[PDB]
Amino acid sequence: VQLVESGGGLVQPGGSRKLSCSASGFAFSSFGMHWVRQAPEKGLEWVAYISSGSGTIYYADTVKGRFTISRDDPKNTLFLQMTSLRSEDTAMYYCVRSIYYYGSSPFDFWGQGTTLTVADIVMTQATSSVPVTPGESVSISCRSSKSLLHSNGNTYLYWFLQRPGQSPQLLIYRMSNLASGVPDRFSGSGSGTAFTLTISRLEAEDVGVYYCMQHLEYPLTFGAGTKLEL
Amino acid sequence: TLSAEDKAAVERSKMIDRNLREDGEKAAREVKLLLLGAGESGKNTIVKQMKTGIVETHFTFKDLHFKMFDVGAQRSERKKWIHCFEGVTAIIFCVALSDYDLVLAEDEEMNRMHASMKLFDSICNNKWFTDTSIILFLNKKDLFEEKIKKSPLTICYPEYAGSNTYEEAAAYIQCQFEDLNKRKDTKEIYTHFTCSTDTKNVQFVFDAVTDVIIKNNLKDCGLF
Amino acid sequence: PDWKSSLILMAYIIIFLTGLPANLLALRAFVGRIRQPQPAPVHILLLSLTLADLLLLLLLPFKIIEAALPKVVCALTSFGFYSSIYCSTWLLAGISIERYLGVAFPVQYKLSRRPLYGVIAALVAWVMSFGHCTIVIIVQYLTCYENFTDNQLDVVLPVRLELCLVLFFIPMAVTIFCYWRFVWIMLSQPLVGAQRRRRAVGLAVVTLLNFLVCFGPYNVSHLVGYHQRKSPWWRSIAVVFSSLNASLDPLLFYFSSSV
Amino acid sequence: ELDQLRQEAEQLKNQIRDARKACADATLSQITNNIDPVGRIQMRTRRTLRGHLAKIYAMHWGTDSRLLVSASQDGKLIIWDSYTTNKVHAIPLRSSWVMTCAYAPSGNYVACGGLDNICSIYNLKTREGNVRVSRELAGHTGYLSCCRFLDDNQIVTSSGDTTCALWDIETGQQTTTFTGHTGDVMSLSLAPDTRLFVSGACDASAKLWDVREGMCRQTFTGHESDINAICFFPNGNAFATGSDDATCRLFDLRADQELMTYSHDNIICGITSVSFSKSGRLLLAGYDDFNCNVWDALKADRAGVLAGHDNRVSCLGVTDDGMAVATGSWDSFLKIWNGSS
Amino acid sequence: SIAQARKLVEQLKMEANIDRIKVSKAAADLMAYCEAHAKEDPLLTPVPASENPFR
Ligand SMILES: Cc1noc(C)c1-c1ccc(C(=O)N2[C@@H](c3ccccc3Cl)SC[C@H]2C(=O)O)cc1
Ligand SMILES: Cc1nc(N2C[C@@H](C)O[C@@H](C)C2)c2[nH]c(N)c(S(=O)(=O)c3ccccc3F)c2n1
């Protein structure tokens, strides 16, 4: 499960570049792909998406039409064609995979990351930084503009931890289920509006920025981001 | 009414559905030839002729891909798994021609040929095997050529009123298996005496399968 | 409303009564088969033929009442009647082609049995009937079609001849050729005993004779009307035979299989 | 010596017969007669799962009572979402001849077996996202009829070699081999406590096996033909059997004798599947007349028909919570029955 | 196969040694279990459509 990305670098305003994400170690054909950008000193933002078999294609409102996404399953590669790049488009773009079935864990694994130095649900975090000490318990909380509890009974929350110098890693999907490989010290619950992440005794790897992401409506607006000081 | 991945979950099912239909159509383009050999009579020589339990042998002739299952290896109760093969295009049966005089080693009471006939009797008029044909094969007839002269056929069928001529005796062997077929209005067996070195074994099976294909096509067009 | 007309009305009534229920069971069986996986093109053609036959039968009362009036209602009913008749003709041609292909090229028919061929054959038949009828009725618009003027008949007759030549002669030719080839293959091939070959050849001959006997009067009346410059008076019994074929098609294609 | 042993065996058979007769105080019909009948249990086809291209010989619900896995001769092991008719996975089997399937209690494994004599364990919760063969269990010399998951590491498989076996997924070797049947074992039913399991065979006999020990405990007889299917009572103190005689019978663990028989004059078709309910009162059974006649577990009176299948009902299993009764049949369509209010 | 026959004979040794209980006593367990879980059982007593997962 390795996602090597290429195509980043310095670009002039209004230029065009192609971003290539290489998939190896998993069934790329059966896995949906997402493009997530990370502006410097800013939270994550959803860019584009391609479905399994290139069935349904969605784009962010600020990038709708201006960007195009394609895949080549014979080569197990992902392509994001960039057109008319502006100054805002600079970010740390990530190649994110996701499978969609009952009991699955979408946004499980994230790519290395490439930098390009040229009605929506509002997710707000109470604080952007909470000092922490080992052996203590902290509860990162978030807010949602609308209730995230669908009639199916699922609270569509995806928690991510961004270790410094590392790509974001899933912690809890659907607000109750722990992801594979995540230590049991992470826990979360709440209602469609009340949100929390009851973290147990912090460790060295718990440092970084914590993000809360909604998934009920597809615009996929990420949270502001809360940092956990050592 | 459907969530973001709930819509994607349905999209995943459609891809799964397309693969099943694509693979199911390919399976319907294949001929499944069950091989119910007798005891040390068939399923060992003819299997090589067309190029622990189920051993599926695949050979392509005239752009048709046949699947041949030799279940003779299994020694369990035949009636409890014979329904798995319900729907095969044909049932390639095999009876050795040298078992007319040789008695069954294990039974030591009745000759091996009658055991094959008894086995053939159950298969021919089985409840599930009423529509599927039977490509009967009389193999190892080269040994029967001189065996009939030295050993008279009266050992197995004393009612046989004929001389030591192979053709006269062989015709009775053909006539002694057709009568066991009860459903004569929905199943016809294509008996064929074959040698060991002859290469026409593959061609006859294709011709007999083609007759089954024509009959199946007739049922679709509304005719037969 | 007497003699001929009474006989035509009685024939229509008995045809309608004998043809409805059989059409319902045939439609149910064909939709059940099309719901079943891996369908053959002949199944789709049979389903489309049954649908066209049911559409033809639904408009029968509007002709039975006439046998003994409404207005533009009469116009539409004639459009539907004739379009369904010609659609049934083309679908019978398609079914005959399907039988010839499935009995003359068995391994190829098995290897390539995509239902899209049947779907587009039904589409071609439906287009070639309904579009022709629609354009001719539009050119007409821009008793109930019984009497025509001198110029009106002078325009109808060549149109009748051309329409017959396109909608029957080609389907009849392909049907007779495919059924002749099917019969020749059936009696000139080493196959199962006469218990099966004879039934198939008899059913094929019966189908061809039914087609050529039922859509024989209506189309030959087209030609005699072209030649004599006068509408045949027996077009009523001709279309009676055309509806007779629709009534007994379920019996020939579906009932005969079980019985 | 054999003469003496043969005589001794007959005497032992008579000894247990007298004990069973002495302990037979009364039939279950006589004692449980004041209880009211369940009533006309009418069912509706809530879902019509239709993905399989061929005959269906096996199905099994998951522990969550939402996901089920069906095995078919097409060569697929589709895992369905019964709530929304979604196919989570479509596992292409190596051998199309599959007559059994199982769902692990954790839900991370599914096993298939059949005429290939090999139980193939499949891994669902995989990082690569595609189901893969965890380990193929070989060693059976005959066709495999039914396999049930003891846990994520032990599986109990019953084959046509007249012997059942316990396997270890990590190693792949037969930890225990249960032998003693004189006919092909057609089905087994794991007990809720996962300490014992019973399996009927073609010899019209059902034996109580002990996974911890490895030898038969009690042997049950009474049927006239091959026992095609078996199920275990929810309490763990009884089990029902289905045979070709069209007389499903209930056996008691402690009493060591048959309690009731479920036979009807009209019904002559064999029984292909038997399953209880959550409370052990609704004895579902899959007959060969295209029906699934509901039998009361305490009155032996038919309470339903469930006639909605074109062909024989090969498999049928109630859920863990008892909210659905799948009735997958040879017509390539599963049917999630449910009792409407 | 005297040892095989002995093994067969020895098989019924523990089977005969099973302390079988009365059927009437065993009958009490079966009927009591059904009525104790009759309310919990959805199949015997159908649940309202507002709580039935299969609409
Ligand atoms: C063109 C034109 N201009 O004036 C007139 C009059 C026509 C004209 C109209 C109709 C026809 C004509 O022969 N038909 C059409 C028809 C007839 C009746 C009702 C509906 C329809 Cl569609 S359908 C088949 C054919 C038929 O009778 O079988 C020929 C010519
Ligand atoms: C190329 C073609 N055209 C067809 N139709 C005929 C009529 C029904 O409609 C028109 C629109 C086109 C076919 N109909 C059928 N049955 C076949 S085929 O599957 O038997 C077949 C396919 C490949 C090679 C040989 C075959 F025999 C087939 N093939």
Side-chain angles (χ1 to χ4, degrees), chain C residues 87 90-91 117-130 167:
Chain C
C87 165
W90 267 87
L91 288 175
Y117 302 87
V119 172
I120 80 164
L123 287 188
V124 159
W126 262 330
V127 158
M128 207 76 110
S129 307
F130 278 90
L167 280 184

Side-chain angles (χ1 to χ4, degrees), chain A residues 1 25-27 30-31 97 99 101-103 108 180, chain D residues 64 66-67 81 88-89 124-130:
Chain A
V1 192
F26 60 90
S30 302
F31 263 99
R97 77 167 196 178
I99 217 180
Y101 55 72
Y102 174 75
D108 193 13
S180 60
Chain D
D64 48 64
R66 170 159 182 177
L67 295 178
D81 189 1
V88 179
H89 299 101
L124 303 182
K125 307 302 179 56
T126 173
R127 191 173 301 270
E128 292 85 9
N130 47 355

